[PDB]
Amino acid sequence: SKGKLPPSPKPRLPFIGHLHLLDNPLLHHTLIKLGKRYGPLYTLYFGSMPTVVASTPDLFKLFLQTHSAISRLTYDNSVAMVPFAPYWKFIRKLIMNDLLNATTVNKLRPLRSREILKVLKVMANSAETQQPLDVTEELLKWTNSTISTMMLGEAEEVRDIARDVLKIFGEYSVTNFIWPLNKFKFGNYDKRTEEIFNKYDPIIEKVIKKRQEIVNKRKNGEIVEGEQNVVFLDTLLEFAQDEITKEQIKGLVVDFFSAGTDSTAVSTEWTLSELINNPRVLKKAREEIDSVVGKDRLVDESDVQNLPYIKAIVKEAFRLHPPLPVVKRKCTQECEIDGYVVPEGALILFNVWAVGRDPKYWVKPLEFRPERFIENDLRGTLLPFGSGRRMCPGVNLATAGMATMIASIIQCFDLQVPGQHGEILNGDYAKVSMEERPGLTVPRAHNLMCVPLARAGVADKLL
Ligand code: HEM
């Protein structure tokens, strides 16, 4: 018990604290340089707010222990609603009563498979035209559609809400500087953005109405025909009035759309980019798929458990390119971490990007070497056991779902990299830039452009 904060740099300035030292939009690079001098736990003042920066796994675990836990999720996204929002108590009761469980997420697999197939068919078309495909854009549409279809169904009104949610996400990303809602200003927008906002509430109200009558017709024993797929919202509506309000249902839907869907699109692109840049690993990945699954049917989500190298590839891309390089938490009460005092209300920053590249934990950390997870949650979480990860379609998409998409892509296609003067790069130049774009979520700065090439025995046997 040293009775003092973790060490801090100099100088601390009256109003801005240490903010003048943050001279890099990619904050995690600056936090590493500071960590080299001041150690694995140090204090920065974001204005008047003390902010403690940790960069070891042991420090992360200390911040997750109970005193009430000394740190909590922030409201940067809707995941914080799970422990804190009162209307999420309804979800917790469904879980404890075995009415919402892992089987609920497993039964959505056919919906997830059809969304995967849609992407493969887009790539197949680009293979036939031999035209560059914006894989970044396709992965954003894939994750956005899969979330909305799992939640609400295949109706055309859900296609409309998916396009609207993606547009809202677009307006949410332009208010971002480094972290979201930092350059936001109270303004008037325009008629274009106004129509985007006003479209959401009437569309979701109609979708809930159309799903409520399906639930009622199933409850009263009446037969239903047309769309036999059961959506996640149907499970919520089926027990909403047992013996939760419409507004609170709409609030759950808002939370379901804003928990970080884009993280899966970002991590999928980082993984594909590492595979393109590491032909040895990509060849070995296709050999596993050809051996475990074969060339006669598409990879299925049930195969992922039998694809250890594919799972190691996802872990290895997560180690090098965590979607959130800096994870934020808030101190809930005065506590002591490794002898230092952490004050109530302090912002806590986990530099997970630094840990992923630290030679103290990883042999040759700059190498994309999935074997490190073999020769010795397929991403390799901070929420306690029993928080509901097993019942969440978003966690499924971020793990088994992304692994299935990546395996399906490389099973069917070679990814050619187009060049800047009428040529396809290959093979020493067949690489993509790994430069980062600043953000809370940090994607590749350059969109992933690829010219798919159908592998031999794929068009007729698979697509
Ligand atoms: C119904 C549709 C739902 C959607 C579309 C959705 C969406 C998401 C997404 C996109 C994430 C981010 C996962 C990641 O990238 O790491 C997430 C996280 C999470 N969700 Fe959901 N969710 C849904 C329902 C639920 C439910 C019912 C629960 C019940 C407790 C739940 C609990 C969680 C938890 C605990 C996390 C955090 C997991 C972690 O950080 O490791 N979700 N959700």
Residue numbers in the entry: 30 to 96, 108 to 283, 289 to 421, 431 to 434, 438 to 520
What's written in the study?
Another 2-HIS native crystal form with a P21 space group diffracted to 2.0 Å resolution, and the structure was determined using the molecular replacement method. There are two molecules in an asymmetric unit which form a dimer with extensive interactions. The heme prosthetic group was observed in the structure of 2-HIS with well-defined electron density and is located mainly between helices I and L with the I-helix on the distal side and L-helix on the proximal side, surrounded by helices C and E and the loop before helix C. Cysteine 449 acts as the 5th ligand for the iron of the heme cofactor. Remarkably, however, the location and orientation of the heme are quite different in 2-HIS compared with other P450s (e.g., human P450 2C9). The heme is moved, relative to that in human P450 2C924,25, toward helices C and E, with a distance of ~8 Å between the heme iron in the two structures, and helix C has also shifted, by ~7-8 Å. Compared with P450 2C9, the plane of the heme protoporphyrin ring in 2-HIS is tilted down ~50°. The two propionate groups also rotate ~90° towards the substrate binding pocket, a very different configuration from classical P450s, in which both propionate groups form a strong charge-charge interaction with Arg or other basic amino acids. An observed structural feature of 2-HIS is a large pocket at the edge of the heme, close to its propionate groups, and this is likely the substrate binding pocket. However, based on the present 2-HIS structure, the substrate is not able to fit on top of the heme iron, being located in a large pocket at the edge of the heme and close to its propionate groups.
Isoflavonoids play important roles in plant defense and also exhibit a range of mammalian health-promoting activities. Their biosynthesis is initiated by two enzymes with unusual catalytic activities; 2-hydroxyisoflavanone synthase (2-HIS), a membrane-bound cytochrome P450 catalyzing a coupled aryl-ring migration and hydroxylation, and 2-hydroxyisoflavanone dehydratase (2-HID), a member of a large carboxylesterase family that paradoxically catalyzes dehydration of 2-hydroxyisoflavanones to isoflavone. Here we report the crystal structures of 2-HIS from Medicago truncatula and 2-HID from Pueraria lobata.
